[PDB]
């Protein structure tokens, strides 16, 4: 027997345990067209039909993007391309109104409500008009059977979407 | 009615996503002592009681160290330290042996085995032994009723003790 | 050494494996209070204002019932009601509309929207009023500091409001 | 104008939450064969060979039975059988030892370690042999690269290996 003393400069009393962490993935895309009818007059919608190229997500992260692309996720292949459709406007107040229109991920169709608020109605600095709006909702994974081999708890269901638009008169 | 040509410079396409990661909390603690007892004629241990003063805890994060001092956690305050006392020691090769001991946290004491690997037994540079070890098993917070107010899902129920030890003879 | 033959009937050639599961808790409260005023000659509310009782939370499980009256959710001894007062009705249409009011869970008030649907609005049996709408929306846990030692992971920050009411005429 | 009150009896005041709940999923394989060689003069293994058709999983649950011999799981077309094969047995005492071998899930192989506790060697009714062991330990989902499509948060990386035998002897 023999008895000794730690050093402990060379020794490591260590542990390991894992957690959990929820966090917010946020994104945009970069590359998209739209059509805008806007009645300023009545602060009403006419026409929004929203065209967007799935190939330009941006989730700040370039391995992930790529990921994105694939069978597990967007098929950007098969369906290079993301579209909203407006139906229906009906306004709230001047400020508020109820979207409903017709998304389309990956060949599937759902008619979504997204809240439109007018911030901000002007003729600018050449006598041309603008407007600032945003639209907002949440549309659920499901609905478009989006991502169906990713489980509900490693990825939420629900997307919030969040649409914020400056934009210019015509020719 | 007025149409619209957006401004992708002060336009964002967004979207917010929720997703949960598991990752490692990797430990140690900075400040502990021990009695070591071991025969290198034999490869056993012969006595090995650890005490470790839990308000040295390091997880590169100060705040993270200062919350596993409160209630919820290990209660510093009421048990300032932990404590391990060898009761058997099960010898397999001279490389390995099973140690069974007496794990105590937060005044709660269940006997754990832990897998012991003698990485190197030495005469050292001046001709007094030296030994280097290693310390590892799993502990369930629950058998210790460890932070019960978290759950399992949040933070794992299993603990990986990895206990690496370099050690010099005494006097 | 001998040989041995397996006796299948008394053998179990078994394993554990640990998963999650995502489930809907449903719930609603068996008594409350409120008052009603709403105009059928424009499917406007005037009025609405709701008071309670969460010592009559019922979500079909008598010890989690139990529990959420305890400090870690509702603390219904400190604060037995929650509360709900209409601060503006904006008209959609005659089958919709946006309500804004207070909602006040164990002292904390924050303004919420709910989605009103009016489901049908009739002359009844006896030629006295009905009507049967519904108020949908959600709320978050966080806005409320509710349950906030119950982890985001745990427990959905999300909770999906679904009232349905039908009604009659008073007097 | 006009003042409503409810009907309690075809109103619910409703809601909705989203929460976690971890389990065990507990299994076993209804048919496999094995060949055991053990001397009961020194309480030693001296050859331990099973194998186990995949097909034959039980989770008291015929859907999910079914899914694990699919192409995200076991993939049981392709390799019906798995297979483990003691390499090394290192005594520590008659009751006790540590089991070394070779497991092999869908074709990939990794070396394991089993504990085995010996619960009792006797001579049988009729003056021939029995014994009855259990082997236990766990291994990594990951080492295997099983299921490797299911994150480790909806299901655990570690399996927990409950082998119960009693057994006869041969001829």
Same mark, same amino acid.
């Given at each position: 027997?023999?008895?000794?003393?730690?050093?402990?400069?060379?020794?490591?009393? $260590?542990?390991?345990?894992?957690?959990?962490?929820?966090?917010?993935?946020?994104?945009? #895309? %970069?590359?998209?067209?739209?059509? +805008?009818?806007?009645?300023? !007059?009545?602060?009403?919608?006419?026409?929004?039909?929203?065209?967007?190229?799935?190939?330009?997500?941006?989730?700040?992260?370039?391995?992930?993007?790529?990921?994105?692309?694939?069978?597990? #996720?967007?098929?950007?292949?098969?369906?290079?391309?993301?579209?909203?459709?407006? %139906?229906?406007?009906?306004? +709230?107040?001047?400020?508020?109104?109820?979207?409903?229109?017709?998304?389309? +991920?990956?060949?599937?169709?759902?008619?979504?409500?997204?809240?439109?608020?007018?911030? $901000?109605? !002007?003729?600018?600095?050449?006598?041309?008009?603008?407007?600032?709006?945003?639209?907002?909702?949440?549309?659920?994974?499901?609905?478009?059977?989006? !991502?169906?081999?990713?489980?509900? +708890?490693?990825?939420?269901?629900?997307?919030?979407?969040?649409?914020?638009?400056? !934009?210019?008169? %015509?020719?």
């Amino acid at each position: 027997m023999k008895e000794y003393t730690l050093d402990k400069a060379h020794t490591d009393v $260590g542990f390991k345990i894992k957690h959990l962490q929820i966090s917010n993935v946020k994104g945009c #895309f %970069k590359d998209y067209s739209a059509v +805008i009818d806007f009645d300023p !007059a009545s602060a009403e919608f006419k026409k929004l039909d929203v065209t967007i190229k799935i190939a330009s997500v941006n989730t700040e992260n370039q391995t992930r993007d790529n990921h994105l692309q694939q069978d597990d #996720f967007f098929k950007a292949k098969k369906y290079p391309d993301m579209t909203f459709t407006m %139906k229906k406007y009906e306004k +709230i107040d001047n400020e508020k109104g109820k979207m409903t229109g017709t998304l389309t +991920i990956a060949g599937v169709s759902k008619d979504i409500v997204l809240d439109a608020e007018i911030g $901000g109605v !002007a003729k600018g600095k050449d006598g041309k008009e603008k407007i600032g709006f945003s639209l907002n909702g949440k549309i659920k994974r499901s609905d478009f059977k989006f !991502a169906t081999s990713t489980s509900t +708890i490693t990825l939420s269901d629900d997307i919030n979407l969040n649409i914020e638009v400056e !934009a210019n008169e %015509k020719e």
